[PDB]
Design an enzyme around this catalytic site. Structure first.
Site, mmCIF file in Angstrom:
data_model
loop_
_atom_site.group_PDB
_atom_site.id
_atom_site.type_symbol
_atom_site.label_atom_id
_atom_site.label_comp_id
_atom_site.label_asym_id
_atom_site.label_seq_id
_atom_site.Cartn_x
_atom_site.Cartn_y
_atom_site.Cartn_z
ATOM 1 N N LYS A 59 9.181 5.929 7.531
ATOM 2 C CA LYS A 59 10.010 4.855 6.390
ATOM 3 C C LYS A 59 11.360 5.072 5.550
ATOM 4 C CE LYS A 59 5.043 2.354 6.106
ATOM 5 N NZ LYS A 59 4.411 3.098 5.406
ATOM 6 N N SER A 94 1.130 -1.220 -0.025
ATOM 7 C CA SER A 94 0.110 0.385 -0.416
ATOM 8 C C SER A 94 1.019 1.081 0.422
ATOM 9 C CB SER A 94 -0.876 -0.017 1.070
ATOM 10 O OG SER A 94 -0.277 -0.343 2.725
ATOM 11 N N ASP A 121 -4.100 1.707 11.622
ATOM 12 C CA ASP A 121 -4.015 2.558 10.005
ATOM 13 C C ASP A 121 -5.120 1.880 8.993
ATOM 14 O OD1 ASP A 121 -2.661 3.026 7.765
ATOM 15 O OD2 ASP A 121 -1.038 1.678 7.962
ATOM 16 N N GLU A 175 -4.801 -2.382 9.451
ATOM 17 C CA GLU A 175 -4.507 -2.479 10.386
ATOM 18 C C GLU A 175 -5.035 -2.810 11.804
ATOM 19 O OE1 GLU A 175 0.045 -0.693 10.467
ATOM 20 O OE2 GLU A 175 -0.534 -1.386 8.289
ATOM 21 N N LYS A 220 5.968 0.287 14.825
ATOM 22 C CA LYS A 220 5.457 -0.756 14.636
ATOM 23 C C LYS A 220 5.914 -1.317 13.293
ATOM 24 C CE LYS A 220 3.130 0.366 9.920
ATOM 25 N NZ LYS A 220 1.409 0.993 10.007
ATOM 26 N N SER A 224 8.609 2.409 11.502
ATOM 27 C CA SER A 224 7.767 1.247 10.774
ATOM 28 C C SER A 224 8.058 0.739 10.125
ATOM 29 C CB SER A 224 5.947 2.391 10.060
ATOM 30 O OG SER A 224 5.595 1.196 8.873
ATOM 31 N N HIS A 225 8.159 -0.323 9.985
ATOM 32 C CA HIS A 225 8.561 -1.205 8.403
ATOM 33 C C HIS A 225 7.736 -1.104 7.028
ATOM 34 C CE1 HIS A 225 4.939 -4.635 10.050
ATOM 35 N NE2 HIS A 225 4.513 -2.937 10.215
ATOM 36 N N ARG A 226 7.942 -1.940 6.849
ATOM 37 C CA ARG A 226 6.840 -2.470 5.346
ATOM 38 C C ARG A 226 6.653 -3.555 5.154
ATOM 39 N NH1 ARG A 226 6.815 2.312 1.989
ATOM 40 N NH2 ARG A 226 4.522 1.814 1.756
ATOM 41 N N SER A 227 5.405 -3.349 5.019
ATOM 42 C CA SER A 227 4.692 -5.154 5.048
ATOM 43 C C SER A 227 5.052 -6.270 3.315
ATOM 44 C CB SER A 227 3.272 -4.480 4.219
ATOM 45 O OG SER A 227 3.202 -4.504 2.772
ATOM 46 N N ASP A 283 1.167 9.350 6.918
ATOM 47 C CA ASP A 283 2.062 8.187 6.747
ATOM 48 C C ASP A 283 2.025 7.982 5.153
ATOM 49 O OD1 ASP A 283 3.398 5.264 5.571
ATOM 50 O OD2 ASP A 283 1.585 4.388 5.797
ATOM 51 N N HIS A 327 -2.808 -6.660 2.626
ATOM 52 C CA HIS A 327 -2.265 -6.999 3.180
ATOM 53 C C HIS A 327 -3.033 -8.547 3.343
ATOM 54 C CE1 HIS A 327 -0.279 -3.648 5.411
ATOM 55 N NE2 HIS A 327 0.414 -3.804 3.796
ATOM 56 N N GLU A 340 1.748 -9.338 7.411
ATOM 57 C CA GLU A 340 2.341 -8.416 8.082
ATOM 58 C C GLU A 340 2.172 -9.764 9.765
ATOM 59 O OE1 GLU A 340 2.093 -4.345 9.232
ATOM 60 O OE2 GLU A 340 2.500 -4.402 6.699
HETATM 61 O O1 LIG Z 1 2.588 -1.970 8.352
HETATM 62 C C1 LIG Z 1 3.427 -0.773 6.813
HETATM 63 C C2 LIG Z 1 2.560 -0.270 5.985
HETATM 64 O O2 LIG Z 1 2.268 -1.698 4.313
HETATM 65 P P1 LIG Z 1 3.408 -0.760 2.963
HETATM 66 O O3 LIG Z 1 2.884 0.431 2.565
HETATM 67 O O4 LIG Z 1 4.600 -1.635 3.534
HETATM 68 O O5 LIG Z 1 1.886 -2.240 2.214
HETATM 69 C C3 LIG Z 1 1.604 1.248 6.412
HETATM 70 O O6 LIG Z 1 0.905 1.115 4.906
HETATM 71 O O7 LIG Z 1 1.256 1.721 6.841
HETATM 72 MG MG LIG Z 2 0.746 1.617 3.255
HETATM 73 MG MG LIG Z 3 0.527 2.873 6.402
#
Ligand SMILES: O=C[C@@H](OP(=O)(O)O)C(=O)O
Ligand SMILES: [Mg+2]
Ligand SMILES: [Mg+2]
Ligand SMILES: C[C@@H](OP(=O)(O)O)C(=O)O
Ligand SMILES: [Mg+2]
Ligand SMILES: [Mg+2]
Lengths: 433, 433
Positions: free
Chosen positions: A342, A39, A244, A166, A393, A369-372, A317, A157, A209
Site C-alpha cells: 500500500k 481499517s 482479509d 473481506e 486486490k 492493494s487499494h485502500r477502502s 498488511d 467496511h 469496497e
Molecule cells: O482492502 C483494503 C484495506 O482496507 P483499509 O485498510 O483501506 O480500510 C485492508 O485492510 O487491506
Molecule cells: Mg485495513
Molecule cells: Mg488488510
C-alpha cells in the site's frame, strides 16, 4: 524539469476529502490522487487531516494541500531535478519533512506529489507508466496479475455483523486478465442471486469496497455463499478464495471478538488459538489459498506459529505496513510469506518499491492493494504490472473506484499484446513464467 | 482528421460490460465510455447487448464494439472530417445505422464514438472540453450547476418496499460548487448516522448510485429522514429536496401501485389523481422543489394537469428520453417544464445538444443526468457547464463513478477562477446570470 505543482482537495469514494496533485512539465499535466484507509494499522505513516470539526467532520485535507502548494512545490522546482529521478525527488521530500512517520507534511501530502512525479517521469521517458515503474524497480519481463475480488464485505467496511473484512475470489484458472474479469464478474452477479434467494433482495446492497453486505454473522456462511456462487457459475476448477480478516480491528484485551459490531460482551471473545483453529477449518472445508492479517498487528507469536503450520499464503498488511523495518522483522520471525503493498502506508513510490523488492528478495509474494477509500486514480494498476508481483486486490467488480483499476489492467494487457503473460496459478511467484 | 478508432469492452460501475472508445488524432489519444440505465424508458434509443446467456449473463457488448471497429471507424476515417465537425461526424454515423432508434449498431456504439470525437475536437480547438461544448451549443456564458445528490432509494431495483426511485438533496444555498460538495457530503454522512440510529447499522450499506435503502414502505418516511439529516447537519436554510419518482416502473392497468413490490393486489392501486394529491402533500410538508417522472411515460393527461396545478420543477426523463420529437410534444402539451438530459437515451452528442437547446428555447430548465450504470468517464461534468443548464444529478457523494463527475466540476470551477458563477438559487433559470 518541474514547472508547477498544484494540489487540491477532492472527494474519495466514501465522500471524504483527499489530496489530488497536478504536476506540470514541458510534456504536459500529470495528475494523481491519494487513497485513504478505514481499517488503518497503528504503524502506518501519518495521514494529516485538518481536525476542523465543523468542516467535513474534521476530515478536510487543506493543511496537506497547503504543505504541497507552499512548501513542497518550490522545494522540488528549486532542486532542478528531472522528474525521472524518482528516488532523489522522494528523498528530498522525506528529508524536508524530517520525521520518521511523515508527520510534518502528512504522508498524504508527500505521496500525492510522489505519484504525480512518477507519471511525469514516465512521460519524460516516452514510456507507459507500467514500463517506467518496471525500470525504476529493475524489472524487464512484465506480468498481468491475478485479481483478488472482495465480493462479500464485512468488518469495518459494511453495515452487518460479519466480523471478517473481506472475502475474495481469485480466478487463478483464467486464460488471461480479461478472462479473469469475466470470471470474477460472473461469479459476483451469480453471488447476488444466491444472496437474494437466500436472504431477500434487501441483503444485496454493497459495502465500501463493492462486495455484497448481507446481514450475516457467521464467517463460514460468507465462505459458503462464495463457494456456492463459484460452483453455480461453473468455475469450481478455476477460482479459489482469499480472505482479509483484519484481525487488529477486533482485537480486544488480548483476545478476538467475532461479533465486534454488536454491543460489547467479553464472554464471546475467543483466543488466538481458537481463531487459528477456525482458520484451519476454513482451509480444510473451502478452497482458501490466502489469509491476510489473521492476527493483530502486534501478535507476532501467533503469526509465526500459524505460518509454520499451514501451506497457504499468509499476508502481512497492518503487520508490515509497507515498511522495510517491520518487513525485516517479519522475515526474521517468519511471520508471514507475502506483503500487502500500500503506497499510502509508507508515503512514497520509492519506499513502496523498496518494500516490494525487500519482500521479493526474501522469497515472499507481494499483493498490491487499494485502500477502502479510493479514488478514480489508476496508478496501482500500472504499479502491479511494473513490479511484476502477480496479484492485486482492488475491490469487487463493482463501484468504479475499483473498476477503474481493473479496466486499466485490461488496457495494459491489450497494450502488451502477444507479450502479455498472466500470472494464473503462479500468482505467488510469477517469476517462473 | 481521425487517425485511428479502437473500441473495447470495459466494466461499468455495476460490473456489467460497456463500450469504451479510444480515438487518435495528431493531438493524441481521446477516450470515452458509455453509461447504462436500469429504469430505462421504453422510448430510449436501443442499447445493443450480445444476448449470449453464457457470457456476462447475456450482457456482453462485443457486437457494439465490432460495429465500431469494423464499420463505423473506417467510414469516419475515410471521410477526412476534422474532429471539430461534431454534427457532420454524428450525421455520418446516424446515416450508416439508418434506423430511427439506432438499433443496427446500438446507441452504445454510436455514442461511444460521438463522445470521443467531442473530446478530440476540444483539443483540436485548443479548448477545455466545457468551452468546446459551449461553442457547439452557441453559448458564451458558463455556469457551475447545483448538484442534486441521490441519498435514499427505492424503486424497481431496490429491495425495500419504497416505490419511489430517488430522494435527492440540492445545496441551492451554497457559496460555490466546491461549497455545494461540502454541504452534500456533510448531510450524506449525517444521514448515515440518522439511519443507523433509527434502523440499525445493517440499513447503511449503499445502492447502485451510492445512496441508502432502509426498509421502509412510506415515501413520506424517506422525505422525513432526508429533512432530519439536513436539519441535524445545520443546513435547513441552504438545502432543498428533489425526487425522481420513475412512475413508469409502477404503472399498472392505467393506475399506480405504491406497494408494487408486494404480491399483486389491484385493490391498493391509486389513480393518477390520487398520486398527484400525494405529491401536493409532499410539497406542502417538505422542501420538495422538483419532481421527475411523476407519472407514466405515456400518461400525458396527468403530466399536463399536474404541471398546470403546481409551481415546482417537473422533470421529463422517461417521458421525453432526450428526444427532440417527444420534447416537441411535451412542449405543445405543457407536460413538464424541465428536461432530464441523458446523452445515451438519444445516442449522440449532437442530438443531445439539440434536445437541450429545444428545451431551453421553450423556457424549460434542463438537468444533466448520469445513468445508474456509470463509468470513470466525466464527460457529463464538462457537458453541464458548457450547456449552462444550472443543474446536474450524478449520484450520492459516494462511489467514484459519481465523485469523478463532482470532482471534475470542482476542477472546472477552479479553472474558471474569478469568472466562476454558481447557479445556486437560480438553478431553474440560470440564464438570469
Ligand atoms: O482492502 C483494503 C484495506 O482496507 P483499509 O485498510 O483501506 O480500510 C485492508 O485492510 O487491506
Ligand atoms: Mg485495513
Ligand atoms: Mg488488510
Ligand atoms: C438515474 C436514472 O436511473 P437509470 O439510469 O436506471 O434510468 C433515472 O431514472 O433518472
Ligand atoms: Mg430510469
Ligand atoms: Mg429518472
Amino acid at each position: 524539469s518541474i514547472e508547477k505543482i498544484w494540489a487540491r482537495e477532492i472527494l474519495d469514494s466514501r465522500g471524504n476529502p483527499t489530496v489530488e496533485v497536478d504536476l506540470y512539465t514541458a510534456k504536459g499535466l500529470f495528475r494523481a490522487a491519494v487513497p485513504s484507509g478505514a481499517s488503518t494499522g497503528i504503524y502506518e505513516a501519518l495521514e494529516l487531516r485538518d481536525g476542523d470539526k465543523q468542516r467535513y467532520l474534521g476530515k478536510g485535507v487543506l493543511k496537506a494541500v497547503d504543505h504541497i502548494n507552499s512548501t513542497i512545490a518550490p522545494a522540488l522546482i528549486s532542486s532542478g531535478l528531472s522528474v525521472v529521478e524518482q528516488e532523489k525527488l522522494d528523498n528530498l521530500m522525506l528529508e524536508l519533512d524530517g520525521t520518521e512517520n511523515k508527520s510534518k507534511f502528512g504522508a498524504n501530502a508527500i505521496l500525492g506529489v510522489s505519484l504525480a512525479v512518477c507519471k511525469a517521469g514516465a512521460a519524460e521517458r516516452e514510456l507507459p507508466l507500467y514500463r517506467h515503474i518496471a525500470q525504476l524497480a529493475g524489472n524487464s519481463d512484465l506480468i498481468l496479475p491475478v485479481p483478488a475480488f472482495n465480493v462479500i464485505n464485512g468488518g469495518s467496511h459494511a453495515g452487518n455483523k460479519l466480523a471478517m473484512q473481506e472475502f475474495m475470489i481469485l480466478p487463478v484458472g483464467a486464460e488471461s486478465f480479461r478472462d479473469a474479469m469475466r470470471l470474477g464478474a460472473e461469479v459476483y452477479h451469480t453471488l447476488k442471486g444466491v444472496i437474494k434467494d437466500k436472504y431477500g433482495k434487501d441483503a444485496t446492497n454493497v459495502g465500501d469496497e463493492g462486495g455484497f453486505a448481507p446481514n450475516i454473522l457467521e464467517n463460514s456462511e460468507a465462505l459458503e455463499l462464495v463457494k456456492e456462487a463459484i460452483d453455480k457459475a461453473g468455475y469450481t476448477e478455476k477460482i479459489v478464495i482469499g480472505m482479509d480478516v483484519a484481525a487488529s480491528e477486533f482485537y480486544r484485551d488480548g483476545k478476538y471478538d467475532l461479533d465486534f459490531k454488536s454491543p460489547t460482551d467479553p464472554s464471546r471473545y475467543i483466543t488466538g488459538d481458537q481463531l487459528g483453529a477456525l482458520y484451519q477449518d476454513f482451509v480444510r472445508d473451502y478452497p482458501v489459498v490466502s489469509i491476510e492479517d489473521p492476527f493483530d498487528q502486534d501478535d507476532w507469536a501467533a503469526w509465526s506459529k500459524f505460518t509454520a503450520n499451514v501451506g497457504i499464503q499468509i499476508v502481512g498488511d497492518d503487520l508490515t505496513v509497507t515498511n522495510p523495518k517491520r518487513i525485516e522483522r517479519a522475515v526474521e520471525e517468519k511471520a508471514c510469506n507475502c506483503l500487502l503493498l500500500k503506497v499510502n502506508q509508507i508515503g512514497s513510490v520509492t519506499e513502496a518499491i523498496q518494500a516490494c523488492k525487500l519482500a521479493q528478495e526474501n522469497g515472499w509474494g507481494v499483493m498490491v492493494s487499494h485502500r477502502s477509500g479510493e479514488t478514480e486514480d489508476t496508478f496501482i494498476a500500472d504499479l502491479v504490472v511494473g513490479l511484476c508481483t502477480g496479484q492485486i486486490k482492488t475491490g469487487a467488480p463493482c463501484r468504479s473506484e475499483r473498476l477503474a483499476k481493473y479496466n486499466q489492467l485490461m488496457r495494459i494487457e491489450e497494450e502488451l499484446g502477444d507479450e502479455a503473460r498472466f500470472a494464473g496459478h503462479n500468482f505467488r511467484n510469477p517469476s517462473v513464467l
